[PDB]
Amino acid sequence: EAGRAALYKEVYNVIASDGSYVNYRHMALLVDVMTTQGGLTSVTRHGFNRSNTGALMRCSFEETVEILFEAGASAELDDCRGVSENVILGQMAPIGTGAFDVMIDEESLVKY
Amino acid sequence: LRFGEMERDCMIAHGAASFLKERLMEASDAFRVHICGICGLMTVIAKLNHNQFECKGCDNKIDIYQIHIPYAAKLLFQELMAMNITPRLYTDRSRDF
Amino acid sequence: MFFIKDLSLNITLHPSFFGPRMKQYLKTKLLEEVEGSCTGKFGYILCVLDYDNIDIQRGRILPTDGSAEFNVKYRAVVFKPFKGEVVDGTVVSCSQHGFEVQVGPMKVFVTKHLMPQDLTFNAGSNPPSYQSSEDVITIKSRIRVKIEGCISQVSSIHAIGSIKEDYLGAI
Amino acid sequence: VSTSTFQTRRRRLKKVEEEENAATLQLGQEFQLKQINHQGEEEELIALNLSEARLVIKEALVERRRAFKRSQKKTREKELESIDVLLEQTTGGNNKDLKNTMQYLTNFSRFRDQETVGAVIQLLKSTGLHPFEVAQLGSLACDTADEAKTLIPSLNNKISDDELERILKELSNLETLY
Amino acid sequence: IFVYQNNITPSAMKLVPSIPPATIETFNEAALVVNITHHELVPKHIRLSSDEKRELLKRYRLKESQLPRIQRADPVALYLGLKRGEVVKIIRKSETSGRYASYRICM
Amino acid sequence: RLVKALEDIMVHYDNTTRNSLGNVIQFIYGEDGMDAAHIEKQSLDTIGGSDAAFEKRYRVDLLNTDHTLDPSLLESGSEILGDLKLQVLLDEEYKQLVKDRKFLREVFVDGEANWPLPVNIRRIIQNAQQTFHIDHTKPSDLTIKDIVLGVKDLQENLLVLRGKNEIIQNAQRDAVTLFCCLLRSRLATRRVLQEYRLTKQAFDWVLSNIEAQFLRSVVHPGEMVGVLAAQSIGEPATQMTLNTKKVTSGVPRLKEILNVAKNMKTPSLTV
Amino acid sequence: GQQYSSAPLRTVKEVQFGLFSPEEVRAISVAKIRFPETMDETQTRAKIGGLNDPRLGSIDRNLKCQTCQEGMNECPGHFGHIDLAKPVFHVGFIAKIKKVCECVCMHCGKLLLDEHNELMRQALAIKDSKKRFAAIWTLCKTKMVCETDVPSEDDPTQLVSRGGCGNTQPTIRKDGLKLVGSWKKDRATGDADEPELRVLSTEEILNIFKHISVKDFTSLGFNEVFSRPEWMILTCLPVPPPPVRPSISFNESQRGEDDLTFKLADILKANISLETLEHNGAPHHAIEEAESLLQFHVATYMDNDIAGQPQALQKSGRPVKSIRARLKGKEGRIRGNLMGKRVDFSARTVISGDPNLELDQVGVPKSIAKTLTYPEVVTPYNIDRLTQLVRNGPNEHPGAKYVIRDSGDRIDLRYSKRAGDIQLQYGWKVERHIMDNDPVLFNRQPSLHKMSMMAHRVKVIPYSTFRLNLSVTSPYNADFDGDEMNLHVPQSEETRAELSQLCAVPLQIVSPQSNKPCMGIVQDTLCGIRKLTLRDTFIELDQVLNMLYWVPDWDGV
Amino acid sequence: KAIPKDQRATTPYMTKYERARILGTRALQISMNAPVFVDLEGETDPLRIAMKELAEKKIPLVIRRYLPDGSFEDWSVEELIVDL
DNA sequence: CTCAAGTACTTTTTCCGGT
RNA sequence: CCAGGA
DNA sequence: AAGTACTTGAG
Ligand SMILES: Nc1ncnc2c1ncn2[C@@H]1O[C@H](COP(=O)(O)CP(=O)(O)OP(=O)(O)O)[C@@H](O)[C@H]1O
Ligand SMILES: [Mg+2]
Ligand SMILES: [Zn+2]
Ligand SMILES: [Zn+2]
Ligand SMILES: [Zn+2]
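A: This is the predicted complex of the input protein with zinc ion.
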């Protein structure tokens, strides 16, 4: 918890060194993201890219072919929840506009 | 023009879901394969016009679907296959969560 | 046999039909596709039961095209034959090879050899007949056949049937 | 697109085994005893004896003619003409299969009346025999317990020889005249 | 709890899991000289009951996985004698909300 | 790297901030559940000043011939004197304001009153004054109950989380905490009547607008906050290059930080 | 365009990774793939019934595919196969193959540690497929003996017999594409003192892997359905179809075969050599020679950039492009063909600022407007307008390029002998020129910002440059020293809405990056604004009247 | 499994994205000669027709808002507040 | 069996004519 | 690959 | 280059 506070303090100071102001929330998110696993998760292929996200998603950054080889070897199942995977699949990602579904109601249709 | 990763990124930031799908599909790559519902690969000998479907070595002349994926993805899957990796594409779930 | 079966069909409606006579267009498109149909999985889908209570559910609008997809849940009468099934039918055709028997929507063909020995072909009759010592089998005669095997053939199902064993043959 | 069921089973890569179907009462995956209706409830297999079947379709199309004429506001040889007319009214007409089925049923039905088919259905569904056997006992006219036990080879030890012969008596009595 | 001066032999340390359902804890006297919980940067952690946890997960529709984790070796996890699976509710002062509550599941 | 780490993160329909595993990153976006565009630097008056000058500004004492609201401030001014029942409300009020001050002083250790918060209250009051043509002479048609309770009610309508249970309602309470300190600070009885000179109607309109403006301010389930954060940290650093104690800083310190560099360049303590 | 298919259209909800069982490869295969020769049926320019279409995909563009009857843009490729004369390691699994041998007995195929060991039961407890394998390995790598009898889960005086086999285990080390062991031995208690040094054959590892129990291998990474360890060893090789390795077919009679088409023949040649060598008078060493060559060719076909240096280099010195290389980031599949693509309905030119444009508009040069096209559906609301644009043709500004029939077959207004007499029917599509007020995605790379890509109102103007309002300069980080910008035209009534409703320039005025406006008055306007507003600065009627008129929304007061 | 109407918790206000997707979807439908549930007061652009339908709350669409667990709350465009 | 130096791997901004 | 552009 | 992960060999 104190690691998170230190980490932010330290990040904020690089941005604020230049003078430039970045809203809390953005730094907080990054800081939180590295933190949540229980320790200091690097923003490298050794950090986030080795977490339990989808094979297609992780293969899109840094270790590629190697990631896909271990996918085949351990019979990995891609959830297909990540932006990246839907981009690779050419599907509407569950991002903003795609975060929900649209339905026609015959009830409302017959009312008008 | 190349609609780069950085460019994708802003569309993701805007939440322009359909817009991104259109750039990556409709207005580029966009292709149609026939996949098998048992061994989730591009195996299907879709003689569309004769309405014959088949996937010999599944003996599946029934459980077949069509999907719209970027041709580069069709390619990626065929490339991984050539390298012994099976990227099985499935049109339903099992895991839930 | 002849079953009532709970089935469901996904139909994709074009926006031009997003009028208030929608459920009606859907109920009919279902019948167009489903009714009369013949699959190996379910056999002959003959008649959709309970038209008044067909479950349309909510239609999901398909992203880049305008259309909406509905899984039309329903219940219908199906005919799915099996081997070992003893069926009563009427003769339809007759040759030196055997005779076809019409069993509901389906045809069961009885081989010259799938019949008892006594019963033999007779080309010299109108229409050609199978003449036994005491029996005669021709185009209008009613027969009781045992289905030996089935073949799922596109928009149909066919079968080879025996009349050689006990209690089978002409009725 | 084609029709789906209520049986969802995840056949993941594992293609086959597909055992033959028989009078070892070994019907399909789809035609097994423990079915599921759209209400999600476990329901039993619905097998019909041609007459139990004739009356279902007859009823269905009759009630379809009601719905059709509402939405449009703003003796055997004689039953055959009556039915072939109702088909032209409610069915696709392209559906030759139903026209054949309806005639076959009209000519091959063992019980003409709903009340008659009622008692058939009562008498039989008290044997514990499986929907198939129960329908086959309804659609096949048998005299010897043997005739029936030979044509429906599943029955084999499932019923008494005398009990089946007792049932065969009542089905012959119920048998509507033509 | 066992407060040791310098060390505990690899011999003695093998007798720690020996007596269940009862539990044992090792603590180097030197680490304890200053209380870490008192630090500016260390927020108010609270161990949740078996019922409280059940509610947390029900109330947010979570699997145990989805919860931000705390290491079992974590100084504060040791301080409270946190056991794997136990959740801590962390109350921090927020420059945005005034007070913000996070939760961490034990590792 | 910042984009690929955060890509999959967004606000869900429960205001929770989850990745593609549905793992909770932030329970509520940026601890407050507000969209950054809607935020503005506002001054939490209550934080600073002499304990003396705080009292002069906020305190109403209907039981003191000197510390009452003059009958020049409101119509009830005369009949309001010595009203024990109302002096109970004004006591709750002032005791809550003092609570607020001590709490804020815990959060903001140096007494920085200027913090970016949603709903610019200064503007709302300003706008009410020109909208209703506030007569800085004439006494208000407000009751102590009109102000005191009106504020207290608006507070219950500042909705970030909607759930009907203790966890969520206690989380809703928490999310709204700091905004309320500001709200109570700007809408205290003395402040409203003496400084703003708001009419009952003007006040009602101020309240409605705070409510509307607040609700508008909350983040939208679907907001792709992951990418947003990456670019918001990223973009500065990229221009901070492309354009025109001595501890490692800038681009290399940032590189040090994200990489979680063990052997760092200038390790320093501050005792 | 692609033709109608009766098959139900779906979305990929899950991707199930795994490995190819040789049996699957043979099952799915439409041909084997016997001759290194591409084609020329004895010089006769047509595909050989042996490599690259012995039923496979298709070439010629004319002439349909031999299996599906589709042809070129419809036919995906069709897979083939090569039965390898001897097993070979898949390059990618070489260390996982090693790490498995390290965990399992090299004789019985049992795990070197089991339920009986305490740290083992603790590690077997690990839920994570990767973390479990990690812990099993570090534990078993050191167990150099398969245990027959082991100390019981009580008193160690009475020893419980687990699985059988006593056998000493090798100390495996990799010698590039070869896995070699070193069994300690025993000889007068001392040994080693010179141990048993021998290479582990692909076939023996295979037979051990084959014997690894489901429960055993399933405790390691593996899944009994999709990926058994025996499938990390290649027996039957899939042959990718032409669409994967197309010939760059220059002139009529001339080849130009792909790098993979060569590498496959290389494999094919190495395989036939080995096959004949063993079937004939096997000179033993000559076999373990032609074997290791086929192991190389099968290795380098998938990954050419291997640690053990010799790059399989083309006769030209230049190295062969491995499949691994094709997918490696920034350029190449994932990063360069999928995460980013080259797009249609894109335009780019030199940008120059305009003080007479509105904040949200973008000056589009007539030539650019006349090229870019939006597909509009023939509806009764626009039927007449569209018929005029169609009359106008692809040369006039408010005009059209193509008309899309029900049939789906495009009518080129540029040539169509019926470009005049062309009667539009509802539900058709007219691809019309981009018009004043259409929403378009305007962008300036970098694109560090969400704001570096905003939606604008089209304004068709003369002169070859994209004109933008000066205040919109800042977000893009644009200037006019020779900067160029990109324009993207949405094609859906749906994507149009996405731009207009979410990413329009006026919506982006206040930035969440800093919780303040990201656009303001700049340069001339800022400089002049100071000058205009000093007390000192007064204006006579004549000018005041022109300044007043200039404000488009002035009340006339 | 679908949250009942009397158990819904999500914003009673329409998200920026929901509005955009609704307007897009209707425009795309209207454009494909779909039936219009409003008086076109001389309107010819389908986005403007959709804006009009949204204003009169005569759009027959439902937003299915999925929660991270998979469960969802169905909301009519008629029932959603439009403060955007 | 714990300890150290050594080797193994992986990457380094975005977009846009001539040999 | 080389030479350039913001 | 430059780092860090991973594996190696000496004490
Ligand atoms: N190599 C590069 N890579 C990426 N972006 C670049 C780039 N070079 C230039 N740019 C883009 O173009 C801008 C550079 O402007 P330049 O033409 O170099 C003059 P400057 O040094 O930025 O300002 P100045 O002329 O007032 O001294 C950058 O701020 C950036 O957004
Ligand atoms: Mg410039
Ligand atoms: Zn298949
Ligand atoms: Zn083909
Ligand atoms: Zn062994």
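Strands of chain E lie at 2-4, 26-28, 44-47, 69-70, 87-92, 100-106. Residues 92 and 100 of chain E are 5 Å apart (CA to CA).
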